[PDB]
């Protein structure tokens, strides 16, 4: 079969509505998530018109072989959703309400410059290509369009799944094309990071400082080295997997900077040993009690200067 | 085909039933289980009603495409069900009974606040969509529940596989829908962790406390720091991936306080020593003196009042 | 089609062989293995018996469409079985030979008590459920039971691969279903572990012995806690996936021993100290002299009395 | 169906163009990735030719079934492309204008020498074997060539997506095959390099510098070995999956240099406490203050050199 | 369709050829490597014989379902093999030339005794069951065996790709079977394991021999033990999937002498500190000076009877 011909010249109206029935497995390194949802589509296909005393039936139940279905495709999946054609009704003026549940891999990019403190605006884009008879433009069906209750993504709070209403119409390969965005915006649950990540790591960049309190080399060089070796390690044991960013990160300048202290404390750690052996036990004694402020009064306002930055 | 038309208004009745063959794969970071099963399905459909003396067979089977099939569906699987159908049976008054043999990845929220000593109800939910003709409504077959005596679920004891009676029946994208909820009630084996993971990890916080019997300075640093990052290497090592959580577990308070242990033992080492090197041995000796029983003490109490708050 | 019809009251009899091509894959955390191989079935369906002088044939070629062709599952899959129909022969008496080549991951439960000198009996369930017209029973073509000469598992000697004779014939839903166990029986090839993890881990625990030639408590903290780091460093390098086990295995116990050995030896280098510096050298003496014989003796005695216990 | 004939010996002429959507999953262990792309062919099929007059249309849409296709592969693929066919349209004179989407998984080469500074050119073969009845020719349409805007790799800038549209005509196993190569410009973003991964590094290499004005052995050997095991372990913690190369890459030679560089700092610091301990300071003073210098000089040589020799 | 009858008894011969696009993913760990590539058949079938003055072509085309066609399928895969169908042709004779593409993943056993100097000849073992009218014999079209000039093995160098002519017949469930083996000769690209991984790890090594030239007991505990972490840690940054195999590898041998080697260091390391401590310094100091040449030669003697051993 081939599309519904214009009464005008006027372009056919695909009325669409996505509905979250399930949403899992959001990927940070691969920059994807799936879901499981329903997909409506409405458009008019006036050869379908019928008259309810004659048929004796109010609406009309179609297989999709036998009616014309425009082809709607997303732009942003891995490989084309799987789909299963769940109902399809024609009213008397020949309104066709189509409906299918799907799954599909979303590719649809982060931003990590906030992160563990993000938010996330995540992308659903629809797609039509129009035909020689007619051109194929796509609406939204706001009544059509949500989530259920128990719809979660493991670590995300999930604030709204909306549709963007006005399509961008586009020409691509000589042709006509409708695209919609449907918006599911997801802010991270940073709640764990702080007894999880963020205090154990301080707690081992604190330890370090102890050698500001100790003239023993062979201590502060074990103090210094040790616990630098434990941030790394700890780093290995909380790792998650985030993309290499092509803009430098709240949380990558927070880990550089705590590589330079551990840097920094060994070259002080250096400096009051030399001095001591080069007989000047004054000047090794004020870099080390200088340290005991300096170190984390430049740490705790380098951190503001951060956040500041970042938020 | 079209469903089987009312006599009456009444909304058609169709009768559940899923027997457990196999369940494996719990994945704890996911919060997925896999399931092969066999879904039973029972309705009455007087179109298919016969009298058996001038047919000459007590049950007819059918094919299923030659008859009409209730489109029932999960709502919480990954993909769609593989499924075989294995038999229908017509009995003469146009009882149908419908048997499948499916697999499933389902997605199924877990509790990790009790983690490791933990239990947890897993959701098999059943779904019908009501039709233009008629409503359809879905039922337990409590002679048709059960599980294989040799289901087994690797590092899980299995309590129970029931059903909730009563269906959910709410509005959906226009229609009608009749939810089941299947229950699989589960709880984790935890001998494996006493031996595996909290024996060693205490004795490598204990072998720390051994710098109160110890006033070389040098030595006490190699302890504590050392045993920090054994305890880092040991979490390596056993590790198992639980997914980040909005809310605070038992084992997360544990090993946020294992580390604040680690961190005031650090202190305590720290101005041990500078008494000492301050010419205060006195103050230095009744701090390492008292550290002895208030470092293991404390750690007692605090988790009693933790295991207290979490049981 | 529907089944052959009973002579007298008879059960029909389908006469199973499995004929392994491939095993692969056997994973031991997940308790699954991957199996490539033959199905034969062989049954007698009258309906399909004829006069090879009239035909002109001695033997008859049917497409899996044309013929009644019995259900036969695995109960412990994941998925359905891959299967393709290799051939299908009718004799002159209407008996059926099928033979399908097919691939499927089998779920068999693993027995870790005696790791790595475990041995395993790996178990494919065949199965068919009953009709209304009549009973379906299985039974074992011991000579159509084989394995390829080439058929290896990494890591294991195939011993044997054999069926029980007696099928289980039980109820199940108001049916009753004829199970048979395909044993394919296998012993881990345990050489490797010597070299590779039994010995090195030795190694690494006879280094902390000589602390107890040593009067040096630095030096002692040092090889007592850098061994332990070793230990556990030694054991992320080697480690394999061994799932969570309810009931304590001969590895789980020796592993458990040596953290325990390495807390021993804290305490003795911690008391051997304390002794020193509170004046009493013959008690530290005495104890340290003592351990460089208790130490591998309880070692060697313990080993005997689990190896016992285990084997 | 069977290929339109010529009406001289003319080949036929399949016009294609490949215009991305998505690109995702650059794999460099696996040297693949994965693209979602329209792939366009355009040819004439006199049979399928009509009056529009008598038709009544313009356009005539097909069921790929329908009419004959020609067999367009993908040389360098893991598996066969999934496609969905999105458009067919004939023209009166019979050009046939075909549109499909596909989603592929990509085998191409990356050369490593570079890493991370390195520029990688993608390639998608496209291919056409031809028949007995008449030999098929690819062509490119440059019209129907080109990217989506939003397309991104994670990691890389996407430089130009072009054809080399001479085609490779050659024979295999006694047929014409016609090859076209599709290429994608990409060059790595460097950036998160140098903070995340280079300046650490460095870092923890300079710390073991600082043995060079310590005289104490003890210090000495604790600062170059627990450096060691720092780069080691940072090395683990921000490792990526590169292949192993039968050619010397840029990173590579780096990554040995600074393994020797600890080496012989281990040699320094073994010669310095040797002289010492043989009554020589003198010596051992002019090789530590030589080296506080040379090890940085040698240093910044070395990579000005390699940086030469690889760019 | 049944198989083309014998004129006199013969069996059916079917000339196989290989030609192969693309070689991936050798899987070290399970034994695996990924194939594309085309699979051609020939054999004469008189039924399909036509006069070509009669009929007008000079070849005739079929598809799959229309004729007759051997039923190959190889026996070391995981799954059945991913085909399409290319071509089908006829010559007036009935000679039919058969091609298809396709992608599989085969099980073929590696050779560890000599990694990383290692050469592997992979297997693809084609296979044929006889039928009940004639028996099936496999045949080598060498003119039809051959591969890409652009396949490439990541990690490999592909010498050759060849099949031995012989088929190998034989008996299996009352049938013969026809097997034809393929062989893909290919040698590991070992360079890079020298600057990656060999240098570096005897570099950590000679580290520990440094213990020789120092009297210092908590210097030689320091460098002994603290080289053996580098020493694991180093394994761990650098380690790939290789299985556990039942008999002893060249890599497995070095490895394990290695381990030996600090165990050795440290029985050295505490012996000349107990001698020292026990009144005995002359013994101490001739041990150690003996261990400076001891160690290194008994390192490149033991080497050296390896190298012979395994090569």
């Given amino acids: 079969v081939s599309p519904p011909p214009p009464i005008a010249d006027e372009p056919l109206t695909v009325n669409t509505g996505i509905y979250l029935i399930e949403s899992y497995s959001l990927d940070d390194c691969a920059e994807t998530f799936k879901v499981n949802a329903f997909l409506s589509l409405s458009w008019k296909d006036r050869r379908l018109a019928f008259d309810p005393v004659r048929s004796g039936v109010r609406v009309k139940t179609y297989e999709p072989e036998a009616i014309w279905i425009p082809e709607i495709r997303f732009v942003n999946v891995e490989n084309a959703r799987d789909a299963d054609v769940v109902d399809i009704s024609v009213s008397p003026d020949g309104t066709v309400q189509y409906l299918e549940r799907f799954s599909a891999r979303v590719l649809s990019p982060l931003d990590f410059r906030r992160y563990p403190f993000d938010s996330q605006t995540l992308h659903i884009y629809l797609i039509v290509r129009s035909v ?28 709204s799944f909306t549709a963007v209403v006005k399509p961008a119409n586009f020409a691509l390969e000589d042709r006509l094309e409708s695209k919609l965005d449907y918006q599911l915006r997801i802010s991270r649950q940073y709640f764990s990071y ?100 300096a170190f984390p009064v430049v740490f705790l306002l380098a951190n503001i200067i951060l956040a500041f930055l970042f938020f």
């Fill in 194 to 293: 702080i007894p999880n990540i963020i205090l154990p790591m301080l707690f081992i960049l604190f330890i370090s400082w102890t050698a500001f309190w100790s003239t023993s080399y062979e201590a502060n060089v074990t103090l210094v080295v040790s616990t630098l070796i434990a941030h790394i390690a700890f780093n290995i044991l909380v790792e998650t997997c985030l993309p290499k960013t092509p803009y430098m990160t709240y949380t990558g300048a927070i880990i550089f900077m705590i590589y330079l202290f551990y840097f920094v404390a060994v070259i002080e750690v250096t400096v009051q040993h030399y001095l001591k052996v080069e007989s000047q036990p004054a000047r090794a004694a004020s870099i080390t009690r200088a340290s005991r402020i």
């Fill in 132 to 159: 020689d008879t007619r051109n194929i433009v796509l609406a939204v069906d706001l009544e059509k369009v949500g989530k259920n209750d128990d719809v979660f993504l493991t670590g995300w709070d999930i604030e």
